[PDB]
Amino acid sequence: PRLFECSNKTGRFLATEIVDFTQDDLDENDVYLLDTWDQIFFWIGKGANESEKEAAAETAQEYLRSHPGSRDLDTPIIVVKQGFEPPTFTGWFMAWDPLCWSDRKSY
């Protein structure tokens, strides 16, 4: 439910948590972490450094430890690339998306 913007300034990576916000505050290219019930959605843009995605990935696991379940952490994460916004992920937000009918258009 809560995001996590972690990016490096110049040569050092910085980890910062971001309260459940909307896409409006969603920076252009940054490393965010959206932990949902089914699984955590890892959104990685094009600008996001290779290290940021790595550090921000492990830093998030720390929070997951607070969640229930036993080996729920073993579950794999759905990697996301820059330029793809599925109507499923958006549902994880508090503000519904009009693109939720992307499937209704078909059988």
From Swiss-Prot:
Subcellular localization, as worded in the UniProt entry: Cytoplasm, Cytoskeleton; Cell projection, Microvillus; Cell projection, Lamellipodium; Cell projection, Ruffle
PTM remark: Phosphorylated on tyrosine residues. The unphosphorylated form increases the initial rate of actin-nucleating activity, whereas the tyrosine-phosphorylated form inhibits actin-nucleating activity, enhances actin-bundling activity and enhances actin-severing activity by reducing high Ca(2+) requirements. The tyrosine-phosphorylated form does not regulate actin-capping activity.
Gelsolin-like repeats: from-to residues: 13-54
Tissue specificity remark: Specifically expressed in epithelial cells. Component of brush border microvilli.
UniProt superkingdom: Eukaryota
Family recorded in the similarity comment: Belongs to the villin/gelsolin family.
Name of this protein: Villin-1
Biological classification of the source: Eukaryota, Metazoa, Chordata, Craniata, Vertebrata
Segment of the intact protein contained: 619 to 725 of 826
